[PDB]
Nucleic acid binder design. Structure first.
Lengths: 147, 201, 103, 35, 128, 180, 185
RNA sequence: UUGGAUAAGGUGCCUAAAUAUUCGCUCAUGAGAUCCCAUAAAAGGUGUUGGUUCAUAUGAACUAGCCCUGAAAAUGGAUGGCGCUAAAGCGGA
RNA sequence: UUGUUUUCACUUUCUCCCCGCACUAAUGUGGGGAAAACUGGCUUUAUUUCUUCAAUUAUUUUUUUUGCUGAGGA
């Protein structure tokens, strides 16, 4: 009593207007506040404006109530129990290696590049300048060649 | 604040918020050129703002309306007067700040191809509930006697066509510059290659 | 090319004032890329140079600089209070000032 | 300190029972007065 | 009873509370000034030494700021000679400001005046 | 911990009795439990209710112990119960209440903002009664059932709020409203 | 007040729909359908092999939670009307002068005369692509039609209000141009 | 006099400091906006929300916040002005 | 004139089944039941740096970068 291929295909072809299901078990990165830069899995929904987010202790960020007004969550998801506590929280996360599949998206790659570019020292800043100098030299010579 | 001058696209911008930001910038000393002032939005119904402007219009010096408040129905002049109302124009410094502002309808000649900036703190899409009523400064000016709205629109569409063509050329130039980067990279020495990759270049 | 910078840009706002009352001992200064009190606190010991030009020569040069330094942050939007050897003339409001990298 | 925290459990659970029974008698009196 | 009744009449113009040992020690060590001169000629002076404390109270065996905090905190047999000996503390405004001097500390709305009890320690060390 | 998000309430329980007199040799000891902004405010409110419900005040009331009794687990998820009584500009009215937060401390505060915003009832005009616990299927409020629904979702009609550091004044182009 | 409010429409079998940017593009039999609804916050779920439209409002508070109801019955009636033409039932009315009609130009620029004997010019228009024309059964009847609800409805709306007279008591002077009932082709 | 920190009061611009955070309410074709203070009533209110009460997810009656009517004056005109509606309004935190 | 005890009704799930049999917002749902309990809590064991050890208060010891001031001359 099931419909198979059409059920599989038209759902993918639906192209819904909103995404990133807010089901408990997601992950998140706060956008405003002292925690803007720390990761937290999503726990449940307490009210329309407040939610609860909680990073894995490997990330090292606690179970906390935050308004939905400050949020830009993650697309991943784990399958914990509703009463899953922080003995299974540290297991469900390394069971799937949930974080790794986000820092290969465009925003995550951009964030990592920006972070390490900020952490760059003066010598590697000069190395970047020198590499761009050589690259520009090569751009110019082969642009003259292309004629 | 630290530029020679800032060109601001006033389309979809709330009048008072835009005027306050511009006035503070002018007082701090940044020259501002406001373009497309006829697309400024004002919260509240068009009839509401029409009533407000008629209340302003019925206001004049009884003895001699020549001395009375000039009404300046062009939308650019409306934005200019709103900005002037938010700075101390009676003082020398305030007068300098006021004169450091240029307002235009549409985009005149030396603003076709300088970057137009936007103040998100004054955008309608971020400052007004979608279910709430707003008006358009060009329409309000046309209702109170500006009668140059259509000509500005027809000039704007020609500008749109010119910009469309030149952006279409620019994207081809940019993607050619990108595809020459690809083999400018792998011909470069590995120690510079690795630095460029790991620093996102 | 030439003329290395090694200093940060600032703009001289008015004095440290209230409504209709001024205290010319401290001048408010806004720094280029600072917008928070926490970031403004990063510049405290730094010297501030107000470099202006005169109409005629004074030591064979047409340029005079007056010195001060940032004493504290003002507000929570990256505005600092600076104390100068002599009070900043109000004609200098909106002018460019140098937040030097030393000490 | 296990014994001390056990005694504090006793002290606070006495308060919890007291609040619960105060609730119980309040509800009983309200239900009696309901009609 | 007497001091509490007389304080109740100035209740809306003051805020008072329980000092605690660290706060009274801080008050005496960094804000403690003493009346040194002869009778009615006192000439306010910061402590800076135990000599004047011993001169006015040593014959009464309370010589020393060590002895004198131990007398102010625990309201011992000598207040007439310690509280009176101390000059009135001249405190700075609070570092983070008041809430509303107009309203009571006990009102649901923010306010300042009244008995803070133990909550006066943070106010004191913020005004110190 | 976020201080901007936080309220300022902890648990108190301070034990005493009305003053024993020669007239009444052994007055019974008594008890009551509420929360407010701080312990002294709670004591003032307790004595106000003592004066209003019985005949005793600070002048004829004393105590014999005091403790702070935190909850069993602070970071739980709870469903507790209180009731409200408030006076308006022309009368007095009452109802019950149960709102969901983490625990007891902040359970009171969400209602004060609600009452101030909807009926302009200042905190001096509101009395809360009888802290207890409530069930989940017994809610008669249009919202609180789907709080404990088996599975629920809504989108992110969020309007962005970013750090003051990145809340820059001049933007290159107009931002959008989809995110994620 | 709650969070998700929506209706599962039942798409008529005689149409085929699609969605883009709150602009629904549909095809029935008489033609194709689109409309500007950008005054309301509206999202859509859609299927075609399994069909049915869902127009959904998120966090709809009750003041605007009736925009949905309007459109949910409206668009559901839209495809039905474009399939089977909606026919109201209007009678031209006259107590003394039987109405004079100079219907020039192919249902466009309709005229009215013989209404209180003014013997002047009067003409109220309608929507293009919508017919309001004489029923050959009875001269006193003009059958309306169309494909859209509003198409068949303003064309019956703009008319009752076009040739009104002055200084006569409607309680006894029963002049009008009546619209009574609704039927379909 | 030099620094610091505050009171009252404010932090959209005028104007130094929040287009701060957080939770509700309100759309006004004469909205509203700080004690004194610079006017407003009786009477009408199925919008919101919590209500409260009773009748077998089903009807009313009340009740109270905001908004509207009631609400008309003379030189042109004043929440101080500009303006403000995802408030820069009202009630809190 | 109170203590005291007893009675049932609750919770995890991507468990599964059946009916509407797809009616799900979902890789399901509205209704009726079987499942273990991968939830959880409980009692232990050696360790807290694998991972938490918080918050408040009392009592103490420091620390980064820095503004202003230098009376006196025993």
């Amino acid at each position: 009593v099931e419909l198979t291929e059409e059920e599989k295909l038209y759902i993918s072809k639906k192209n819904l207007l909103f995404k990133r299901f807010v089901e408990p078990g997601r992950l998140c990165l706060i956008e405003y506040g002292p925690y803007a830069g720390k990761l937290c899995f999503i726990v449940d929904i307490v009210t329309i404006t407040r939610v609860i987010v909680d990073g894995a202790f490997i990330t090292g960020v606690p179970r906390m109530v935050i308004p939905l007004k400050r949020l830009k969550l993650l697309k991943e998801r784990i399958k914990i129990n509703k009463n899953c506590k922080s003995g299974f929280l540290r297991k469900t996360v390394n069971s799937t290696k949930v974080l790794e599949e986000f820092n290969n998206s465009k925003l995550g790659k951009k964030m990592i590049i920006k972070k390490k570019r900020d952490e760059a020292t003066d010598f590697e800043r000069f190395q970047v300048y020198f590499a761009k100098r050589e690259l520009k030299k090569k751009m110019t010579t082969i642009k003259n060649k292309k004629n | 604040m630290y530029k020679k001058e800032y060109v601001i696209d006033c389309k979809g911008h709330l009048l008072g918020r835009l005027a306050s930001l511009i006035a503070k910038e002018l007082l701090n000393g940044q020259r501002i050129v406001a373009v497309r002032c006829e697309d400024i939005n004002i919260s509240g119904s068009l009839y509401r703002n029409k009533l407000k402007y008629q209340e302003f219009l019925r206001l004049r010096t009884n003895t001699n309306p020549k001395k009375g408040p000039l009404h300046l129905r062009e939308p650019s002049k409306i934005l200019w007067r709103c900005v002037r109302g938010m700075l101390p124009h009676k003082t020398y410094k305030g007068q300098l700040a006021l004169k450091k502002l240029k307002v235009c309808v549409g985009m005149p000649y030396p603003y076709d191809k300088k970057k137009k900036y936007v103040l998100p703190s004054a955008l309608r899409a971020f400052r007004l509930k979608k279910h709430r009523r707003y008006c358009r400064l060009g329409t309000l000016s046309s209702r109170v006697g500006w009668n140059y709205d259509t000509l500005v629109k027809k000039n704007e569409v020609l500008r749109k066509q010119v910009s469309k063509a030149y952006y279409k050329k620019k994207v081809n130039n940019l993607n050619e510059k990108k595809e020459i980067k690809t083999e400018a990279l792998n011909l470069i020495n590995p120690e510079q290659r690795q630095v460029l990759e790991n620093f996102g270049y | 090319l030439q003329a290395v910078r090694l200093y940060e840009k600032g703009v001289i706002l008015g004095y440290k004032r209230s409504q209709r009352n001024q205290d010319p001992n401290f001048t408010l200064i806004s720094i280029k890329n600072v917008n928070t009190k926490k970031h403004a606190q990063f510049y405290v010991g730094k010297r501030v140079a107000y470099v202006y030009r005169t109409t005629k020569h004074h030591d064979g040069v047409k340029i005079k600089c007056i010195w001060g330094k940032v004493c504290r942050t003002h507000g929570n939007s990256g505005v600092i209070r600076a104390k100068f050897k002599t009070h900043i003339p109000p004609k200098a409001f909106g002018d460019r000032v140098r937040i030097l990298m030393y000490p | 300190k296990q014994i001390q925290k056990k005694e504090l459990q006793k002290i606070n659970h006495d308060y919890y029972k007291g609040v619960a029974k105060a609730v119980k008698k309040k509800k009983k009196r309200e239900e009696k007065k309901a009609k | 009873k007497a001091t509490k009744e007389m304080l109740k009449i100035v209740e809306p113009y003051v805020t008072y509370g329980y000092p605690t040992l660290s706060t009274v020690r801080k008050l005496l060590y960094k804000r403690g000034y003493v009346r040194v001169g002869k009778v009615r000629r006192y000439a306010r002076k910061k402590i800076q030494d135990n000599a004047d404390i011993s001169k006015h109270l040593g014959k009464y065996n309370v010589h020393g700021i060590e002895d004198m905090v131990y007398q102010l905190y625990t309201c011992g047999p000598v207040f007439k000679k310690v509280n009176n000996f101390l000059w009135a503390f001249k405190l700075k405004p609070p570092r983070k400001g008041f809430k509303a001097k107009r309203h009571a500390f006990n009102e649901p709305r923010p306010g300042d005046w009244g008995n803070r009890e133990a909550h006066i320690n943070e106010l004191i060390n913020r005004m110190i | 911990i976020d201080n901007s998000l936080n309220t300022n309430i902890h648990q108190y329980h301070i034990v005493g009795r009305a003053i024993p007199t020669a007239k009444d040799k052994n007055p019974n000891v008594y008890r009551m439990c509420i929360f407010a902004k701080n312990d002294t405010n709670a004591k003032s409110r307790f004595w106000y209710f003592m004066k209003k419900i019985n005949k005793l005040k600070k002048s004829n009331g004393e105590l014999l112990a005091c403790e702070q009794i935190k909850e069993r687990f602070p970071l739980r998820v709870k469903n507790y119960g209180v009731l409200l009584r408030y006076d308006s500009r022309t009368g007095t009215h009452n109802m019950y209440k149960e709102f969901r937060d983490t625990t007891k401390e902040g359970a009171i505060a969400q209602l004060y903002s609600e009452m101030a915003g909807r009926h302009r009832a200042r905190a001096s005009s509101i009395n809360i009664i009888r802290i207890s616990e409530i069930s989940s299927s017994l809610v008669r409020r249009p919202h609180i059932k789907q709080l404990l629904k088996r599975r629920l979702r809504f989108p992110a009609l969020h309007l962005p709020t970013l750090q003051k550091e990145y809340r820059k004044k001049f933007a290159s182009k107009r931002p959008s409203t989809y995110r994620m | 007040k709650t969070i998700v409010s929506t209706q599962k429409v039942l798409i008529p079998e005689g149409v085929k729909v699609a969605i883009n940017a709150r602009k629904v593009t549909v095809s029935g039999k008489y033609g194709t359908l689109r409309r500007s609804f950008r005054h309301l916050p509206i999202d859509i779920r859609l299927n075609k092999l399994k069909k049915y439209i869902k127009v959904v409002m998120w966090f709809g508070v009750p003041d605007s939670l009736a925009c949905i109801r309007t459109v949910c019955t409206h668009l559901k009636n839209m495809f039905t009307g474009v399939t089977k033409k909606f026919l109201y039932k209007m009678r031209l009315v006259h107590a003394h002068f039987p109405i004079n009609s100079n219907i020039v130009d192919n249902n466009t620029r309709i005229e009215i005369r013989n209404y209180l004997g003014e013997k002047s010019v009067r003409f109220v228009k309608a929507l293009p692509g919508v017919v309001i024309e004489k029923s050959p059964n009875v001269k006193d009847e003009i059958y309306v039609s169309g494909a859209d609800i509003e198409n068949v409805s303003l064309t019956a709306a703009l008319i009752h209000q076009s040739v009104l007279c002055r200084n006569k008591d409607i309680r006894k002077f029963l002049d009008g141009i009546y619209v009574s009932e609704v039927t379909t082709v």
